[PDB]
Design a protein around this ligand. Sequence first.
Ligand code: XAM
Length: 364
Amino acid sequence: EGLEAVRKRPGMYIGSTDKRGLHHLVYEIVDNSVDEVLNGYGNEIDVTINKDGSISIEDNGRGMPTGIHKSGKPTVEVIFTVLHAGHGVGASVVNALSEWLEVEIHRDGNIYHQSFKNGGSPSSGLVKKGKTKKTGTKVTFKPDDTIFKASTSFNFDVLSERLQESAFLLKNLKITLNDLRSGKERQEHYHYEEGIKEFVSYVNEGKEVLHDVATFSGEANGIEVDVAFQYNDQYSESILSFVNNVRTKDGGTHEVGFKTAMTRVFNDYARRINELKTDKNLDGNDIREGLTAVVSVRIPEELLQFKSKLGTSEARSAVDSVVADKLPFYLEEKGQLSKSLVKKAIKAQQAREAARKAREDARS
Ligand SMILES: C=C1CC[C@@H](O[C@H]2C[C@@](O)([C@H](C)NC(=O)c3[nH]c(C)c(Cl)c3Cl)[C@H](O)[C@@H](C)O2)[C@@H]2C=C[C@H](C)[C@H](C(=O)C3=C(O)[C@H](C(C)C)N([C@@H]4O[C@@H](C)[C@@H](OC(N)=O)[C@@H](OC(C)=O)[C@H]4OC)C3=O)[C@@H]12
């Protein structure tokens, strides 16, 4: 009954039926809690790997609606049983691929509980039972053995990497990952008050840093932007791009917008402090040498287009504008540092030119 289509072709919805597909089920539920925190409701997400094979995902958000949907069915049943109701395949796909799923909604001092079993078949109605001092939703589900053949066991380190990433992107979000399994009991907490500023320092661990993380945010078009960067004394570039708390591994327009404004502001500043003469412009390449940067954007549903590579042409204009508006003032106020970063980029340009001449001489 709709969920049976998900059960016959799971790959078409979660990619695979291996560790990757198993862990994506966890991410679908985590995302709903993340969305809620974005909207200003809640600040805590608890992920618990249970002894029985299940996984619990709890938040302190508003809690799911308890009432009858536009249709004649309880909203909880609509969410978990109606395909793609509300990647974003929905809680209903998690239910379809679960042996059992339990919902717990904390609303106005009361706990509302609903159970699902086998293909995502309601094994109870929404029952009001228990008193509470908190607001939020808790989803516990045990993956189906027949679906995730030899792949139902949750991996702590896989989840930790993704949960730490979510905490870095949403400052003041506290994520706790708990493993209760015998012989594997562990706990980690991810809470970064300085957000993507803390992400940059993390990516630069084990490398010497040239200055403290430079951060700047703003809004251009309908896109919110967060940019953090810090140079190391090494030569590699490490540009991490994110769209709506989710990584875009192949970059896109938001990444292009950051890179173009960075080259433009650096060149303009270099000529202003007379390091470059009337003498060619520094390439992006020279400027980005040893640069670790995090580009995090928030785009409305209407504007979005592509995933892994953003296509939203307006996001180029958005990042370009925030960087071009904020970076000149950073460089002007950090006079000695910025003069040093200009010289550094000139030396990278000179090194590259000498590599080019040696290559040409070896050819001719
Ligand atoms: C079913 C519901 C009731 C819940 C509501 O979501 C909550 C979610 C919310 O509780 C919050 C984010 N949740 C949590 O905190 C949370 N925490 C945890 C641990 C979990 Cl899990 C959650 Cl959740 C939030 O606080 C409030 C504001 O919204 C949903 C959000 C948006 C819609 C208005 C949606 C709805 O009423 C829909 C419908 O009436 C129809 C269906 C039921 C007839 N529908 C459609 O459902 C299919 C046919 C689609 O199909 C696809 N995509 O293939 C479309 O259909 C189409 C044609 O696009 C989709 O239409 C847009 C809907 O999505 C809503």
